[PDB]
């Protein structure tokens, strides 16, 4: 869900990476500076937060 | 792609800054020409003065 939301919000110039740990995934989204608000807004709409 | 964004945040600053510093390197140099010219404008009047005074003195003296 998170990937979809970010992808529509942030086009294809965002980087979504994840690495496991035994159970879920801690994920990191890497975005350009000044694209911070938009990036955040996308997480907030899914219900995921920082 | 994502590396093409990165080259555009830089490529923008490095023309803003280098356009600004080629107009200070213009500006100092414009004032430097306008000063040397004026320090010789005052030199031009001075010499004249000294010659107009000088000749009048020699006329009176004689």
From Swiss-Prot, chain B:
Protein family: Belongs to the V-ATPase E subunit family.
Functional summary from the UniProt entry: Produces ATP from ADP in the presence of a proton gradient across the membrane.
Name under which the protein is recorded: V-type ATP synthase subunit E
Record organism: Thermus thermophilus (strain ATCC 27634 / DSM 579 / HB8)
Residues of the full protein shown: 3 to 64 of 188
